[PDB]
């Protein structure tokens, strides 16, 4: 052994489950809402199903300039009106 | 005895002979340089640096 | 609280069933909504 | 489809074929309960 | 709790069922309960299929494997294999499901409540693995039972409706078998055919008379052998040749089951008589051929002379010769010229595909059938996307022929592995070194050096 | 003792430099025949019409190949799954044109190797060993069966069996990818985990044991001389190696049981390769890799490509190019 | 942004809860 | 007799916390429609 | 015993997870590479770099998610969050493929950290550092494939993208464009990996089947004691068995295990060398004699020429979607195709 309490002990303790029957669902719900609120989309810049193309466009908004790449992506985004 | 991949370890505590082996290595490398330059000279065509420079040859 | 109260076999069973439920959900999602090809 | 009268049991019927697999899983629960002696 | 931990049994939990080896009552329980599992799956899976069943779609568009088995026996279908009544399916499913309750009941009883060993209870039901007599007697019983089963297939075929016959004159249909093939020349003739192309061993059976007659032969043979093993005990040569122990017997049966699994794989993959393509979909050969036929028909309608059309390779684009001269379909399907099916045979003459028959006699139903079979070839993805591996999602289809063939190859294989495992172990244990080498009696140490 | 008894005793003798045995009785002639025919064919066989379209492919050294390009070429698509022994040909010249050597070699080899497995069982028995080395060998053998026998049966022709050669092997893999998307098949993936994993664990075991070798030698000699064949004492400190690995990850991720450990070392690659073989064997019946072609779709219905769709493009290249004169109709159905 | 509060309110309530429940043993440890 | 907040505790939670959050997210994703 | 030595004391405490000086490099980098990959494959797109969906959020599954390489226009930019491309914007950074370089770089320093860990622990426990040494092969593979290879090419774009399907595409690209299977260094890698798997299998199976009976159990695992001095299986019986089966057999245990180290490690190193070649397009693509013969003689066919036709198909059919920065438009009529297909 190396001093820490056995996991067998911890995960079968009543206290562990009093704590984690709160903390685990809380997290799960936090992640759930992170998606369902739409926040994920905006944090990582990921297209929603209606934001990949404008209505009649069919050209991928591929980044083509290294240093003004950012302004390129911003332009691609504005192009969705 | 020493395994084949260890024969050179005999130089570890013999500074003189280690220097000798390094001298031999350096001789071989210099000899390579000279030889290689001679071969290139015996094959290099200097007549057209424009469309037949050294890197084409 | 004291360790050993909840039997390890129940914990393993519950945990297992939970794993089966969440992966079940994901395989359901292969046929529904995004990624479903429909 | 099933005869109309048994329509009520359609969800049950959807689940039944997987019941055999449960037995395999049960063998393990059982073993866990006797500590894999 | 007798023999239910490693210290007492010798066996770890993961080899736990090996604790049942000389506990005949509990082992009886495991077996009856397992039988219950099997019958349970049969019934439940049947009712599931029936619930998911649309009678005007082909079965093979609907992931069915058991309803096709029932339909092949003539139950529930009419001409062309059209579903005319689902009720027999329902009956088959329900009755299997009800029976599985009985079997599970007896299983659980013998398993955890009944006598753990049977020998002190009944000298009839008790048994010693080493008792060659009793072993051959139980074997005998079960051979009689099997023979009875095969005879039940015969009885269905001859006296209770008949079987579905894809080769029935005028179109596939349920037909009563009135003149089964009883000639041993034919029946065992099948057994002595090459398993190779154009021959196909027993997989080549292509008419219901040979099937019914074959099952008559098998029924008699099995009942006979069963009685014979009841009344006899193994001979000297047999005694010397075999390992006589539970694990040995298990190993023999595992070898046999492996063999049967491979056979069933080839059967469902090639044979379209006991696996009518109406129910199981076209075989691979069948569908490839069907494509050739389809385009011969298209192009000939457009005015092409298919007999004389020369393909890019110099071989005919539509028609060419087999290595023995027969006229056969061209392109890659040249490999499949051993294919035979009721929709193509009207175009076949003594020299193979008949060019006059091809020019004049192709009926619309043949075109239809070839288009269907061509567009339901047994190709598809693991997530049941129908078509070649490069096809886009759209068609939800994987042929039952693929499902059955692949599943049973896997099972046959792992069962061969199991046979090597338990055979090797049975040998070692019977010889007494399954647990390892005696340090004080290492045999190699008593042997002369190799060099 | 009679002559047959003597003969049996020699056959099963634990003292022959190479064990013969009863499996050996079948193994030795079949493997010799397959070997000899393979060497001669590889050196001197004429071009073979593999795809039955009168387009002979040259496999041997004398006919324009090197070690890398050369092969014994599979029998003709016209033959299909027909048995094509030498005596079925009108002449050796025909036999050779149609790729008879291939069938002779793979049949003799498959029989011979199956017997090699059986022979591993047999010797293990004669020597008083436990019997399952042959079960380990069942995995590479099953693989061989998959690519030489089962896939041809499924596809209805030995012309689609694996070629006996290096580049031919690659041909087989590429066409297999094209027609089955084998990369996206979980059994091939398990097979990869089997061989990557086996490689990993081989290096790991080797390095741990080597790392904990007990000092028995000087620096001027090989550490190997510290072990003597047959010595009863273990030659490495397994407690030390376990202390190391256990601390490298955590304790309960390490094996303290050498038997358990070696059993793992056997089971992981063997099971993985079993799944590789079952993969080839089930793709033999066209149950293919996962198809997620056009699986992601935007709100209008535009296809949004994933890496799966790029894979599919590559597969298309292979599909349209392979066997460029053999297809007359739009669907490649075998 | 309200969605960050809505989403990370479960997390901070979990942490607050467990801090409340483990506080005496944590103080005893520290 | 036993400590609660060890190095092991940390490691365990740096892995376990984000995992449960992520699985909540992915769960949610299963009901997204185009 | 000043601050440095006290710190050393704490770093080397025998706890459930050993930390060590090497832990300081290893844990943050390993954690950030794993986190980067999970973050990316759960939430991040590849629309703006590849025109691909690559995350769970977009509907991909475990087989098809990936953290994709940056756009070819990025070149070999470190693509730091604070760099001139993202300029501190986390979202744009994700959209430009910052996660790829994040994962590749933190991953590389993580592998460094891990091998340092192998050294440190081996030195603490008093064993020879052959595990670290063996781990140099994983390092060579990672550095050659994820760093050197794209650094030789136009940009990070042509590095492998971190994902299952993505890796598959990497394989297929290397076949089509490099004829990588024809490369003798790849071939040696294959020999090393398969020979490694074989050695794993055969050694494990052999030990398990030449065990001494050291207990009464029919399940024979408990009949071993980690402290026992005796060999648990018979090397002599094993030797005779393989000698009679295969002709040759191991007789030296130390050599056996060294060999087990040597085969896969060497193999992976050769594969690495080959990939370093492929970085410059220095391929083993053709056999010149083959091409001269086949170009002059339209009846000369081998599996070598067959596979090149396959490659040509791969190139033409995958290039336009796989290489979008090139704006390839290949009209139908120029696509290479066999009859009918
Ligand atoms: C104790 C055993 C000892 C064994 C010792 C060795 C003895 C020889 C064994 C033969 C090995 C296989 C040879 C080729 C098998 C094959 O081509 O099998 C195919 C044949 C089927 O033949 C096909 O059968 C067809 C019959 O259908 C015909 O009839 C039908 C009627 O409806 C239809 O009309 C159909 O369209 C029509 O063509 C045709 O004749 C085809 O041309 C023909 O190819 O199956 C069959 O005969 C029978 C099925 C055989 C099993 C398949 C092999 C499995 C081996 C797995 C080993 C794994 C090992 C792992 C090791 C670790
Ligand atoms: C088809 C699969 C199958 C079957 C039929 C069996 C059967 C058996 N096992 Mg095996 N076993 C299996 C798979 C199976 N096993 C698997 C997968 C493992 C690995 C986990 C094992 C590991 C194992 C070990 C280590 C041992 C056994 C033992 C046994 C025997 C006694 C069990 C007992 O008395 O426990 C008592 C169990 C209970 C009291 C709980 C209730 C169990 C019942 C059967 C549940 C019934 C459920 C069912 C739905 C009820 C329907 C009723 C309805 C008809 C009215 C029994 C014959 C033991 C043995 O051999 O003893 C001699 C033993 O030691 N098994
Ligand atoms: C009629 C078929 C049959 C029967 C009655 C037996 C019976 C036996 N086997 Mg054998 N065996 C068989 C086929 C069979 N085997 C096959 C086909 C193989 C090849 C895999 C083996 C390989 C094998 C080995 C290596 C060993 C045995 C052993 C045994 C003995 C103990 C078994 C046990 O308790 O496992 C308990 C059950 C388990 C631990 C569960 C197994 C879990 C499997 C692998 C999961 C399979 C996945 C499933 C099919 C699908 C996924 C479902 C999931 C998602 C829920 C027992 C006599 C042991 C022995 O030697 O006894 C002397 C032993 O060591 N068998
Ligand atoms: C299938 C194999 C099988 C075998 C070999 C046995 C053997 C035994 N059982 Mg068990 N049992 C079984 C299955 C089996 N049973 C099933 C399926 C059930 C659920 C009904 C039971 C429920 C059960 C109970 C409650 C008891 C037994 C008892 C016994 C013992 C006394 C038998 C006797 O004298 O009956 C005499 C035989 C008859 C009176 C004639 C039987 C008529 C049969 C059933 C007609 C059908 C025949 C036909 C072939 C069935 C086909 C089924 C197939 C389609 C699936 C004997 C060891 C007794 C025991 O163990 O005492 C300690 C006992 O109390 N059994
Ligand atoms: C469940 C099926 C079954 C099983 C397991 C047995 C088992 C046995 N039988 Mg029995 N038998 C059976 C059904 C069965 N029988 C039936 C249905 C009949 C009526 C036909 C018989 C008639 C019978 C007789 C007359 C005798 C036996 C005997 C025996 C014993 C030794 C047999 C032997 O060594 O086989 C191994 C087989 C051989 C050694 C034969 C030659 C081996 C070659 C190489 C076989 C090659 C076949 C090939 C692989 C198959 C491919 C297909 C082929 C048709 C081309 C053994 C206990 C003998 C005995 O001892 O009785 C007390 C005996 O004299 N049986
Ligand atoms: C004889 C075996 C067999 C065959 C050929 C089929 C075939 C089919 N089933 Mg059925 N079914 C079976 C057994 C079988 N099933 C069993 C045992 C169950 C209970 C779980 C079911 C319950 C069931 C349901 C509820 C449904 C089907 C459906 C289907 C159809 C679609 C299949 C599919 O998409 O699978 C997907 C493929 C997989 C899930 C891959 C499984 C891979 C396995 C786990 C690998 C196992 C390897 C080995 C055994 C492990 C050993 C370990 C080793 C170390 C020894 C197809 C016709 C569907 C249908 O369309 O009905 C109309 C459907 O809805 N089946
Ligand atoms: C993203 C920003 C990155 C920048 C860097 C910011 C973080 C710096 C790196 C921190 C890495 C390690 C942090 C956790 C260390 C720890 O848990 O110590 C646990 C210690 C002592 O616990 C004691 O620990 C001992 C057990 S053991 O040492 O944990 O094994 C035991 O002796 C004792 O009884 C027990 O109470 O308690 C603390 O005070 C931790 C201080 C906060 C950290
Ligand atoms: C004595 C004398 C002299 C002389 C000298 C001389 C004459 C010298 C020479 C020298 C030389 C002349 C040298 C040379 C050398 C060389 C070398 C050293 C080389 C090496 C090589 C290598 C090593 C290679 C390798 C390889 C290969 C082969 C393949 C590919 C890969 C590689 C690249 C790796 C004089 C008079 C002057 C003076 C004094 C006296
Ligand atoms: C021994 C053992 C075991 C096993 C067991 C088993 C395997 C059992 C089985 C059992 C069984 C095998 C059971 C069965 C049951 C069944 C039932 C109970 C059923 C019922 C049915 C019903 C109720 C029906 C109904 C209906 C109708 C009638 C109509 C239609 C619809 C419906 C469906 C509704 C284990 C492993 C656990 C472990 C321990 C030992
Ligand atoms: C139903 C049917 C049929 C028929 C069938 C039959 C008639 C069958 C028979 C079958 C038979 C008749 C079988 C047999 C088999 C046999 C076997 C499979 C054997 C085995 C053997 C063994 C295994 C042995 C071994 C050994 C050796 C070799 C040496 C010494 C040692 C020992 C003894 C181990 C047909 C097709 C017409 C049609 C369809 C339906
Ligand atoms: C990137 C980045 C970062 C980081 C972040 C992190 C660190 C994250 C982490 C994250 C994480 C850490 C996540 C996790 C997740 C997890 C998951 C999502 C899982 C899942 C699982 C599953 C799904 C399972 C499955 C399975 C298996 C595997 C086998 C067995 C069976 C089963 C099926 C159950 C920072 C801020 C620095 C900066 C910026 C960038
Ligand atoms: C990097 C390690 C540099 C150690 S620095 C070292 O630290 C001691 C106290 O620990 C001082 O007493 C000493 O003067 C100083 O040189
Ligand atoms: O032969 Mn060799 O490769 Ca099996 O798919 Mn069909 O055929 Mn041919 O094409 Mn694709
Ligand atoms: Ca008897
Ligand atoms: Ca919408
Ligand atoms: Cl064609
Ligand atoms: Cl090709
Ligand atoms: Fe070892
Ligand atoms: Mg979805």
């Amino acid at each position: 052994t190396t001093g820490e309490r056995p996991f067998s002990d911890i995960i079968t303790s009543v206290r562990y489950w009093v704590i984690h029957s709160i903390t685990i669902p809380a997290l799960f719900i936090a992640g759930w809402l992170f998606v369902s609120t739409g926040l994920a989309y905006d944090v990582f810049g990921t297209p929603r199903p209606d934001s990949y193309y404008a209505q009649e466009q069919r050209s991928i908004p591929l980044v083509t300039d290294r240093f003004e790449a950012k302004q390129q992506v911003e332009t691609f985004l504005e192009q969705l009106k | 005895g020493l395994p084949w991949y260890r024969v050179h370890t005999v130089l570890i505590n013999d500074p003189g002979r280690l220097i000798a082996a390094h001298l031999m290595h350096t001789a071989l490398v210099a000899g390579w340089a000279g030889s290689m330059a001679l071969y290139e000279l015996a094959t290099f065509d200097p007549s057209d640096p424009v469309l037949n420079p050294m890197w084409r040859q | 609280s004291e360790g050993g109260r909840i039997p390890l076999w129940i914990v393993a069973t519950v945990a297992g069933m939970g794993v089966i439920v969440i992966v079940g959900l994901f395989f359901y999602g292969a046929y529904a909504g995004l990624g479903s090809s429909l | 489809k099933l005869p109309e009268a048994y329509a009520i049991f359609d969800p049950l019927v959807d689940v039944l074929p997987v019941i055999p697999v449960l037995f395999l899983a049960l063998a393990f629960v059982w073993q866990a309960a006797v500590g894999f002696r | 709790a007798t023999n239910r931990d490693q210290e007492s049994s010798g066996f770890a939990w993961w080899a736990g069922n090996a604790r049942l080896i000389n506990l005949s009552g509990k082992l009886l329980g495991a077996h009856v309960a397992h039988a219950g599992l099997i019958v349970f799956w049969a019934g439940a899976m049947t009712l599931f299929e029936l619930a998911h069943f649309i009678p005007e779609k082909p079965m093979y568009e609907q992931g069915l494997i058991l309803i096709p088995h029932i339909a092949t026996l003539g139950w529930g279908v009419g001409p062309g294999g059209e579903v005319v009544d689902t009720f027999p399916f329902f009956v088959v499913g329900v009755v299997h499901l009800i029976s599985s309750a009985v079997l599970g009941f007896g299983g659980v009883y013998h398993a955890i409540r009944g006598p753990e060993t049977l020998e002190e209870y009944s000298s009839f039901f008790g048994y010693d693995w080493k008792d060659k007599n009793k072993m051959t007697t139980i074997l005998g019983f079960h051979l009689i039972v099997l023979g009875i089963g095969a005879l039940l297939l015969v009885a269905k075929a001859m006296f209770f409706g008949g079987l579905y016959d894809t080769w029935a004159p005028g179109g596939g249909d349920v037909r009563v078998i009135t003149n089964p093939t009883l000639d041993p020349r034919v029946i065992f003739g099948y057994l002595l055919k090459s398993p190779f192309g154009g021959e196909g061993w027993i997989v080549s059976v292509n008419n219901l008379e040979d099937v019914v007659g074959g099952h008559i032969w098998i029924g008699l043979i099995c009942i006979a052998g069963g009685i014979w093993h009841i009344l006899t005990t193994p001979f000297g040569w047999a005694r010397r040749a075999f390992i006589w122990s539970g694990e040995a017997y298990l190993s023999y049966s595992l070898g046999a089951l492996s063999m049967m699994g491979f056979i069933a794989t080839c059967f469902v993959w090639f044979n379209n008589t006991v696996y009518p393509s109406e129910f199981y979909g076209p075989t691979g050969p069948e569908a490839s051929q069907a494509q050739a036929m389809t385009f011969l028909i298209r192009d000939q309608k457009l005015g092409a002379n298919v007999g004389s059309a020369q393909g890019p390779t110099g071989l005919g684009k539509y028609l060419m010769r087999s290595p023995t001269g027969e006229i056969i379909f061209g392109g890659e399907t040249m490999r499949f010229w051993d294919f035979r099916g009721p929709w193509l045979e009207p175009l076949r003459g003594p020299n193979g595909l008949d060019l006059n028959k091809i020019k004049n006699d192709i009926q619309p139903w043949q075109e239809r059938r070839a288009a269907e079979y061509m567009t339901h070839a047994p190709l598809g993805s693991l997530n049941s996307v129908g078509g070649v591996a490069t096809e886009i999602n759209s068609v939800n289809f994987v042929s039952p022929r693929s499902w059955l063939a692949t599943s049973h190859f896997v099972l046959a294989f792992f069962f061969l592995v199991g046979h090597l495992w338990h055979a090797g172990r049975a040998r070692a244990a019977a010889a007494g070194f399954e647990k390892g080498i005696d340090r004080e009696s290492e045999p190699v140490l008593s042997m002369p050096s190799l060099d | 003792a009679n002559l047959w008894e003597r003969f049996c005793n020699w056959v099963t003798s634990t003292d022959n430099r190479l064990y013969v045995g009863w499996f050996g009785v079948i193994m030795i002639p079949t493997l010799l025949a397959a070997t000899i025919c393979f060497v001669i064919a590889f050196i001197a066989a004429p071009p073979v019409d593999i795809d039955g379209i009168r387009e002979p492919v040259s496999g041997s050294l004398l006919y324009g190949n090197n070690i890398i390009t050369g092969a014994v070429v599979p029998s003709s698509n016209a033959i299909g799954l027909h048995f094509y022994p030498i005596w079925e040909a009108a002449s050796l010249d025909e036999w050779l044109y149609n790729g008879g050597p291939y069938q002779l070699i793979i049949f003799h080899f498959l029989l011979g190797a199956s017997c090699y497995m059986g022979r591993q069982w047999e010797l293990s028995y004669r020597l008083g060993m436990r019997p399952w080395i042959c079960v380990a060998y069942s995995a590479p053998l099953a693989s061989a069966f998959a690519v030489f026998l089962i896939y041809p049966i499924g596809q209805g022709s030995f012309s689609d069996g694996m070629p006996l050669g290096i580049s031919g092997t690659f041909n087989f893999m590429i066409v297999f990818q094209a027609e089955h998307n084998i990369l996206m098949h979980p059994f091939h993936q398990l097979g990869v985990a089997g061989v990557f994993g086996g490689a990993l664990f081989c290096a790991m075991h080797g390095s741990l044991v080597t790392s904990s070798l007990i000092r028995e030698t000087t620096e001027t000699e090989s550490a190997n001389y510290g072990y003597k064949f047959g010595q009863e004492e273990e030659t490495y400190n397994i407690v030390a190696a376990h202390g190391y690995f256990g601390r490298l990850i955590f304790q309960y991720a390490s094996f303290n049981n050498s038997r358990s450990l070696h059993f793992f070392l056997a089971a992981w690659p063997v099971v993985g390769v079993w799944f590789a073989a079952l993969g080839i064997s089930t793709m033999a019946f066209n149950l293919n890799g996962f198809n997620f072609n056009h699986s992601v779709i935007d709100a209008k219905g535009n296809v949004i490509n994933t890496w799966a769709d790029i894979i599919n493009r590559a597969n298309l290249g292979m599909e349209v190019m392979h066997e460029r004169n053999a297809h007359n109709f739009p669907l490649d159905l075998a | 942004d309200w969605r960050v509060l809505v989403v990370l309110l479960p997390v901070l309530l979990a942490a607050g809860w467990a801090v409340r429940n483990i506080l005496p043993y944590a103080v005893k440890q520290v | 007799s036993y400590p609660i907040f060890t190095v092991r505790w940390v490691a365990v939670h740096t892995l376990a916390v984000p995992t449960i959050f992520f699985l909540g997210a992915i769960a949610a994703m299963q009901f997204i429609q185009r | 015993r000043g601050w440095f030595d006290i710190l050393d004391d704490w770093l080397k405490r025998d706890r459930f997870v050993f930390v060590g000086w090497s832990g300081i490099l290893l844990f943050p980098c390993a954690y950030l590479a794993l986190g980067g990959w999970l973050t990316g494959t759960t939430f991040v797109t590849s629309w703006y770099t590849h025109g691909l969906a690559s995350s769970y959020l977009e509907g991909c599954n475990f087989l098809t998610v990936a953290v994709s390489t940056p756009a070819n226009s990025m070149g070999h930019s470190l693509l730091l969050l604070w760099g001139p491309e993202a300029q501190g914007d986390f979202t744009r950074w994700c959209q430009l493929g910052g996660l790829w370089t994040f994962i590749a770089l933190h991953g590389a320093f993580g592998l460094i950290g891990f091998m340092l860990r192998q050294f440190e622990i081996a030195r603490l426990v008093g064993v020879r550092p052959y595990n670290a040494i063996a781990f140099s092969a994983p390092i060579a593979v990672f550095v050659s494939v994820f760093l050197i290879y794209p650094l030789g090419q136009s940009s990070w774009f042509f590095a492998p993208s971190f994902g299952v399907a993505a890796i598959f595409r990497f394989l297929l690209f290397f076949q089509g464009f490099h004829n990588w299977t024809l490369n003798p260094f790849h071939m040696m890698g294959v020999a090393g990996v398969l020979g490694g798997a074989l050695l794993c299998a055969i050694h494990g199976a052999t030990v398990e089947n030449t065990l001494f009976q050291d207990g009464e159990g029919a399940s024979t695992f408990r009949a071993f004691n980690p402290t026992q001095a005796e060999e648990t299986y018979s090397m002599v019986t094993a030797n005779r068995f393989w000698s009679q089966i295969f002709g040759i057999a191991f007789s030296n245990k130390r050599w056996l295990h060294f060999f087990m180290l040597f085969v896969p490690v060497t193999g992976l190193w050769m594969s690495a060398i080959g990939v370093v070649g492929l970085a410059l397009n220095l391929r083993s693509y053709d056999f010149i004699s083959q091409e001269i013969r086949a170009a002059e003689d339209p009846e000369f066919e081998t599996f070598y020429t067959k596979n090149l036709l396959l490659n040509e198909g791969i190139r033409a059919w995958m290039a336009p979607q796989d290489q979008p920065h090139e704006n390839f438009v290949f009209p139908e009529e120029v696509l290479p195709r066999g009859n009918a297909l």
Side-chain angles (χ1 to χ4, degrees), chain F residues 172-192:
Chain F
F172 184 82
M173 307 173 78
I174 299 164
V175 175
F176 211 105
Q177 175 57 14
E179 305 184 339
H180 304 287
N181 206 357
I182 172 164
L183 289 174
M184 287 286 288
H185 195 290
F187 280 11
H188 175 269
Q189 286 157 17
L190 284 167
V192 171

Side-chain angles (χ1 to χ4, degrees), chain E residues 345-367:
Chain E
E345 300 315 312
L347 303 178
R348 181 118 47 205
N351 286 352
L353 291 186
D354 198 293
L355 182 61
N356 270 323
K357 283 174 176 175
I358 279 178
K359 288 176 172 215
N360 307 293
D361 293 344
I362 303 186
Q363 309 305 323
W365 72 265
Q366 282 164 303
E367 173 173 353

Side-chain angles (χ1 to χ4, degrees), chain H residues 4-18, chain I residues 10 17 31:
Chain H
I4 293 183
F5 307 103
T6 64
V7 168
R8 191 189 76 171
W9 186 99
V10 173
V12 157
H13 283 71
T14 75
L15 276 193
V17 166
Chain I
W10 190 95
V17 181
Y31 183 63

